[PDB]
Design an enzyme around this catalytic site. Sequence first.
Site, PDB file in Angstrom:
ATOM      1  CD  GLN A 208      -3.485 -14.741  -4.817  1.00  0.00           C
ATOM      2  OE1 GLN A 208      -3.688 -14.137  -5.878  1.00  0.00           O
ATOM      3  NE2 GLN A 208      -3.610 -14.157  -3.639  1.00  0.00           N
TER       4      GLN A 208
ATOM      5  CG  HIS B 141      -6.469   4.363  -4.508  1.00  0.00           C
ATOM      6  ND1 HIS B 141      -5.242   4.275  -5.096  1.00  0.00           N
ATOM      7  CD2 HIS B 141      -6.766   3.126  -4.049  1.00  0.00           C
ATOM      8  CE1 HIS B 141      -4.807   3.009  -5.002  1.00  0.00           C
ATOM      9  NE2 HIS B 141      -5.718   2.281  -4.397  1.00  0.00           N
ATOM     10  CG  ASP B 142      -4.779   2.472  -1.064  1.00  0.00           C
ATOM     11  OD1 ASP B 142      -5.807   2.449  -0.374  1.00  0.00           O
ATOM     12  OD2 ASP B 142      -4.471   1.562  -1.864  1.00  0.00           O
TER      13      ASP B 142
ATOM     14  CG  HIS C 110      -2.187  -0.884   0.784  1.00  0.00           C
ATOM     15  ND1 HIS C 110      -2.403  -2.128   1.289  1.00  0.00           N
ATOM     16  CD2 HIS C 110      -3.201  -0.634  -0.077  1.00  0.00           C
ATOM     17  CE1 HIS C 110      -3.517  -2.591   0.810  1.00  0.00           C
ATOM     18  NE2 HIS C 110      -4.017  -1.731  -0.056  1.00  0.00           N
TER      19      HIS C 110
HETATM   20  C1  LIG Z   1      -8.628  -7.873  -0.891  1.00  0.00           C
HETATM   21  O1  LIG Z   1      -7.615  -8.143  -1.902  1.00  0.00           O
HETATM   22  C2  LIG Z   1      -6.576  -7.314  -2.245  1.00  0.00           C
HETATM   23  C3  LIG Z   1      -5.786  -7.851  -3.477  1.00  0.00           C
HETATM   24  C4  LIG Z   1      -5.404  -7.043  -4.510  1.00  0.00           C
HETATM   25  N1  LIG Z   1      -4.686  -7.720  -5.463  1.00  0.00           N
HETATM   26  N2  LIG Z   1      -4.659  -9.016  -5.050  1.00  0.00           N
HETATM   27  C5  LIG Z   1      -4.009 -10.129  -5.713  1.00  0.00           C
HETATM   28  C6  LIG Z   1      -5.309  -9.125  -3.818  1.00  0.00           C
HETATM   29  C7  LIG Z   1      -5.410 -10.539  -3.031  1.00  0.00           C
HETATM   30  O2  LIG Z   1      -4.517 -11.394  -3.049  1.00  0.00           O
HETATM   31  N3  LIG Z   1      -6.649 -10.822  -2.341  1.00  0.00           N
HETATM   32  C8  LIG Z   1      -6.864 -12.040  -1.603  1.00  0.00           C
HETATM   33  C9  LIG Z   1      -8.247 -12.367  -1.303  1.00  0.00           C
HETATM   34  C10 LIG Z   1      -8.558 -13.602  -0.533  1.00  0.00           C
HETATM   35  N4  LIG Z   1      -7.496 -14.435  -0.134  1.00  0.00           N
HETATM   36  N5  LIG Z   1      -7.532 -15.629   0.638  1.00  0.00           N
HETATM   37  C11 LIG Z   1      -6.241 -16.024   0.780  1.00  0.00           C
HETATM   38  C12 LIG Z   1      -5.861 -17.207   1.570  1.00  0.00           C
HETATM   39  C13 LIG Z   1      -6.945 -17.972   2.230  1.00  0.00           C
HETATM   40  C14 LIG Z   1      -6.530 -19.061   2.961  1.00  0.00           C
HETATM   41  C15 LIG Z   1      -5.154 -19.427   3.135  1.00  0.00           C
HETATM   42  C16 LIG Z   1      -4.112 -18.608   2.492  1.00  0.00           C
HETATM   43  C17 LIG Z   1      -4.525 -17.493   1.743  1.00  0.00           C
HETATM   44  N6  LIG Z   1      -5.323 -15.041   0.133  1.00  0.00           N
HETATM   45  C18 LIG Z   1      -6.095 -14.090  -0.416  1.00  0.00           C
HETATM   46  C19 LIG Z   1      -5.747 -12.880  -1.173  1.00  0.00           C
HETATM   47 MG   LIG Z   2      -7.229   1.050  -0.184  1.00  0.00          MG
HETATM   48 ZN   LIG Z   3      -5.405   0.468  -3.347  1.00  0.00          ZN
END
Ligand SMILES: COCc1cnn(C)c1C(=O)Nc1ccn2nc(-c3ccccc3)nc2c1
Ligand SMILES: [Mg+2]
Ligand SMILES: [Zn+2]
Length: 313
Positions: free
Chosen positions: A269, A106-107, A68
């Site tokens: 992922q 935005h952040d 971020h």
């Molecule tokens: C909110 O997301 C922000 C964002 C922006 N760009 N990207 C690639 C992301 C992003 O990786 N998101 C997420 C979402 C949900 N899980 N669950 C896992 C997980 C569950 C169980 C065990 C290990 C891992 N890891 C993620 C990453």
């Molecule tokens: Mg944000």
């Molecule tokens: Zn952002």
Amino acid sequence: GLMQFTLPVRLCKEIELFHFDIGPFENMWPGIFVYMVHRSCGTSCFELEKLCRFIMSVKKNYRRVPYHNWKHAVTVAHCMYAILQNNHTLFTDLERKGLLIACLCHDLDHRGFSNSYLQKFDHPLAALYSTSTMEQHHFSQTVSILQLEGHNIFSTLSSSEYEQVLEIIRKAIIATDLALYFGNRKQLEEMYQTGSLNLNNQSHRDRVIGLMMTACDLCSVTKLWPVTKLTANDIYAEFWAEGDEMKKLGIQPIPMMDRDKKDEVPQGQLGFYNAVAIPCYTTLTQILPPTEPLLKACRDNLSQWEKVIRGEE
Ligand SMILES: COCc1cnn(C)c1C(=O)Nc1ccn2nc(-c3ccccc3)nc2c1
Ligand SMILES: [Mg+2]
Ligand SMILES: [Zn+2]
């Protein structure tokens, strides 16, 4: 006035592509941003002295957290720049101007923790803003910087335009609260399939801009596989630190945030690409057809993660 910004030839060409990566050289990100405002908005959108001063107070109020940070701000602004060039005639001069500014901003002053963590820790920002906690903090920092002397890049806007641009930016920055994405995308899906989607309807423009904002925010998933993979390290370096901190407050964190659950990252992922990114880029491609390469690229990276799980890399 007669002072073009250029970029070396490889950047000049690759920058127009959605999957461009702004690279490891920090000192070029501002020139990249300015180069995008110029080609997207015109050389006359912003007094060059005021814009350069704004770009550097913004830079100076992003923190050095693993994901971020200043480099995410500019990446997000790039993707927006792509979307606008590929749909150049669907957007007003005010929309084009404030959406790139919205994305750089935005952040602002993010600390590398979820809205969730702020509330569990009882941080003062959660007492002042009960939902979209950091996102209201973000718009709030943008206005602060805008009011520094010599920083008002919007100085020469009618009183009217000025209020409409700050409203576009506000709404745009709120939309990056992913907890509001789901509602927004659902309504956009339905409004589009029932042929009711109307771009002169301002509240329909709002939902579209909301979605673009999620698209740009998540654009790490639309990059060449090795960019996508190394960005996910930075993402998890925040999530697992947040997890650590949850544990320090005596709380089991969600698996996403538990560095004892590294082994399940490809599984999460997949969940993420299937529940969030694919549907985001799908609806957006429906609504703005020339965004298709985000969709296409996103599906390629979903398929690389699948490959990881199968032990094929
Ligand atoms: C909110 O997301 C922000 C964002 C922006 N760009 N990207 C690639 C992301 C992003 O990786 N998101 C997420 C979402 C949900 N899980 N669950 C896992 C997980 C569950 C169980 C065990 C290990 C891992 N890891 C993620 C990453
Ligand atoms: Mg944000
Ligand atoms: Zn952002």
